[PDB]
Design a protein around this ligand. Structure first.
Ligand code: HEM
Ligand code: HEM
Ligand SMILES: N=C(NCCC[C@H](N)CN(O)CCN)N[N+](=O)[O-]
Ligand SMILES: N=C(NCCC[C@H](N)CN(O)CCN)N[N+](=O)[O-]
Ligand SMILES: C[C@H](O)[C@H](O)[C@H]1CNc2nc(N)[nH]c(=O)c2N1
Ligand SMILES: C[C@H](O)[C@H](O)[C@H]1CNc2nc(N)[nH]c(=O)c2N1
Ligand SMILES: C[As](C)(=O)[O-]
Ligand SMILES: C[As](C)(=O)[O-]
Ligand SMILES: [Zn+2]
Lengths: 402, 403
């Protein structure tokens, strides 16, 4: 019933009792494990609402109190007559922090308690969404001293369209499909780039053109907004000892801000609730720059390093990858922009695991996502068994609005 | 769409559906409530398992429903009927052993599955004879550096009688000597088997790479100790292609990886002693065996020799040192003409295996956490391939230590 969890480097054992609190099914069954797959293939609401309110009052050490009992009545009254309800700002703040804390694929959760929550539920137009987004970016960027934040737009409502941010992140580089099939820029963003153009954006022709935002108010066509360049901090990439690296003209933006995930709290759903923390260097240096379906610069860098790209056995791919990740760290450090390397991040996650074991009896974690894309076993998390399950409040994927 | 798991490759955008998982008859550790995919170790019945295996065998030779098939099924039911168990024919053992390998979710080398050399040692009746069979396996498999995959199958577990067992986890292992200061000289992973060898009369050495003797156990007898003739255990001294000082570290590793404590299950029959061997994927040695903190842990030593800043994580000193250590392993095995496969070549071959199996059986059970190499994960194609994990039989399974 309760899984035994072992760390093979230290030989230590724990038991995950928190998983018993999961109310939502994942993709696995006793016949087959689908743990490596990326995407999944009124009384109910009232049930989730009560559970959430209970979590909230327990967090402020006031369960059973009068305020607790009265709040539960309010929620019951609102759902019974309207089919839905609304969260108080303090609950929204607690809810967003818990969603982060519960996110199995996030290795930066040691920071979960420090999140600036912007209540944007009084938003009635895409124009207003844009203003809130600009303020989020300014605050979060903070001149390179990044601060974790989330801006929460109006919840979903029955028979009414959702407030949505079409872009997957607030800052993304365009991907222009070229005549000969290739892509200029970021291949992951070809679809959104095209949508922007289709909606009147005058495209650029570079490899790092910041995309405009396509923001959508309920039941309206999305609207295009160009981000003020001075609000988008970027870091030109250079290498500490390889002088020619800068000549590659590579760069990446400072702020990672997921904008297409749904935040679920107490049964309520927030379809637009962009959040941001700071990058772990491998996200940029390894995946964004070296993925074959992304900027795919490994071969170029290897040739500049004059490595033997003739055979795999020369480990040219491994050598180039390391220097690229080193360039990212060096460059962010030089530009004085917050970033965390994969060793420091995983070491902090092990502390988080321990903190959560004591606090809640476990921590849902997705091993395939927590272990870094390079040097996996050189990090502590590789040797740590993990149990994955869904807790609520939660961040979850949702269909693209188009 | 299809009511089977949909599997996507994110690098290529391609999709397949796994229908082979429908054939699984054993539950894994996961439930809809929680995934335990990252955990390392998470007559009526015999007849059904036996019948299923016979059906698999006849299906494989394209004779399902034939007179021979029905007669073999009859024969197995009667043998189990009067004796409680049954025995496999030679070709059934060969088919079952290859299928067990083919079915192994944690093995990235499965493209080679059809080439296994199956040594039938089911006539073995003593520990001394087990040793002879094992030495022949080592000689055949090593083939002076041009390694050949092989498995030697000893007698199956029998009702009442004791089990045939090889106590060591691999045929070649380096001793791990517990020190006064509490540290370990040699391989920390082998501290327990090393002590057991000593408790059984082995006179211990005092080096970092002392090859351990084998503790072989015949039915209902105490284990017997046998030391492998040095001439038979091929080793490779490690040197680096450019860093001249690497050779001075005195590191080395043996050529033959030969798992000896896994149980081979075929049609319900259990072969407690069936050592198998292929060849190493370089990261097993260069990354795990040499750099794991709980193994040889040589990362800091090598980083210091490379004059890296081991004071801060940000210098990526662990990453740089690990890459050079893996390169030294590949370079040295290549120099010594001993078969080895780097993690890029191996994962590329595994992607081909997945495509072959998609066509041949409708899927391939695979454990993502084990298939993706310990270094440079996303630089290999398997990192971007979703995988379905499930248990198929014949199979190789873990079994408790005999002591
Ligand atoms: C403070 C610094 C933070 C760091 C260093 C960090 C790091 C990471 C990393 C490396 C991943 C995997 C990303 C990928 O491979 O695409 C991730 C995923 C995630 N993080 Fe964090 N994180 C941080 C802050 C946040 C914040 C502020 C939230 C939400 C309030 C959050 C929510 C999540 C979620 C939900 C995912 C999964 C996204 C997906 O499935 O695509 N993270 N994080
Ligand atoms: C021909 C070359 C082969 C290569 C390169 C290869 C490579 C690998 C690798 C890299 C692993 C993971 C090992 C670890 O991380 O400890 C593995 C595991 C495994 N392989 Fe293969 N393998 C080969 C041949 C074989 C053969 C001949 C068999 C059996 C007939 C086999 C059965 C298995 C099994 C059952 C495991 C899992 C062992 C465990 O769970 O500890 N492999 N293989
Ligand atoms: N450091 C962070 N990295 C997350 C960015 C990409 C992630 N795949 C989200 N995403 O695109 C989800 C949509 N499929 N987060 N952060 O600090 O806020
Ligand atoms: N390349 C190979 N590597 C096998 C390494 C040991 C593995 N951990 C099994 N093992 O010792 C199981 C014990 N718990 N195999 N081979 O080629 O035959
Ligand atoms: C197929 C496989 O699940 C997929 O490539 C996963 C693996 N681990 C990952 N881990 C992180 N952090 N981010 C990712 O995008 C992925 N991709
Ligand atoms: C805890 C975690 O499951 C464990 O460290 C696994 C991860 N992946 C692995 N993969 C391979 N090939 N071999 C291993 O020993 C491991 N160890
Ligand atoms: C561009 As080349 C160094
Ligand atoms: C061996 As030292 C440099
Ligand atoms: Zn699972």
């Amino acid at each position: 019933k309760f899984p035994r969890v072992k760390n093979w480097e230290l030989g230590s054992i724990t038991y995950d009792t928190l998983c018993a609190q999961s109310q939502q099914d994942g993709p696995c069954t006793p016949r087959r494990c689908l743990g490596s797959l990326v995407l999944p293939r009124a009384e109910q609401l009232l049930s989730q609402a009560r559970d959430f309110i209970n979590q909230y009052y327990s967090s402020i050490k006031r369960s059973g109190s009068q305020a607790h009992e009265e709040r539960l009545q309010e929620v019951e009254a609102e759902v019974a007559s309207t089919g839905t309800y609304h969260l108080r700002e303090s609950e929204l703040v607690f809810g967003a922090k818990q969603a982060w804390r519960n996110a199995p694929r996030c290795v930066g959760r040691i920071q979960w308690g420090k999140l600036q929550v912007f209540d944007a539920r009084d938003c009635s137009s895409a124009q207003e969404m844009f203003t809130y987004i600009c303020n989020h970016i300014k605050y979060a960027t903070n001149r390179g001293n990044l601060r974790s934040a989330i801006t929460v737009f109006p919840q979903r409502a029955p028979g009414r369209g959702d407030f949505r941010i079409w872009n997957s992140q607030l800052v993304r580089y365009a991907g222009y499909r070229q005549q000969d099939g290739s892509v200029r820029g970021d291949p992951a963003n070809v679809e959104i780039t095209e949508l922007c153009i289709q909606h009147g954006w005058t495209p650029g022709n570079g490899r790092f053109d910041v995309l405009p935002l396509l923001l959508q108010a309920p039941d309206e066509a999305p609207e295009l907004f160009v981000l003020p360049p001075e609000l988008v901090l970027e870091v030109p990439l250079e290498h500490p000892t390889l002088e020619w690296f800068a000549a590659l003209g590579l760069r990446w933006y400072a702020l990672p801000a997921v904008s297409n995930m749904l935040l679920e709290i107490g049964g309520l759903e927030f379809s637009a609730a962009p959040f941001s923390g700071w990058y772990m260097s491998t996200e940029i240096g390894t995946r964004n720059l070296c993925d074959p379906h992304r900027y795919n610069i490994l071969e170029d860098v290897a040739v500049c390093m004059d490595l033997d790209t003739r055979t795999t056995s020369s480990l040219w791919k491994d050598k180039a990858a390391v220097e690229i990740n080193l360039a990212v760290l060096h460059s962010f450090q030089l530009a004085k922009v917050t970033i965390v390397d994969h060793h420091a991040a995983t070491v902090s996650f092990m502390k988080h695991l321990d903190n959560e074991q004591k606090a809640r009896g476990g921590c849902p974690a997705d091993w395939a996502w927590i272990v870094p894309p390079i040097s996996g076993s050189l990090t502590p998390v590789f040797h740590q068994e993990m149990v994955n399950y869904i807790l609520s409040p939660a961040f979850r994927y949702q269909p693209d609005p188009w």
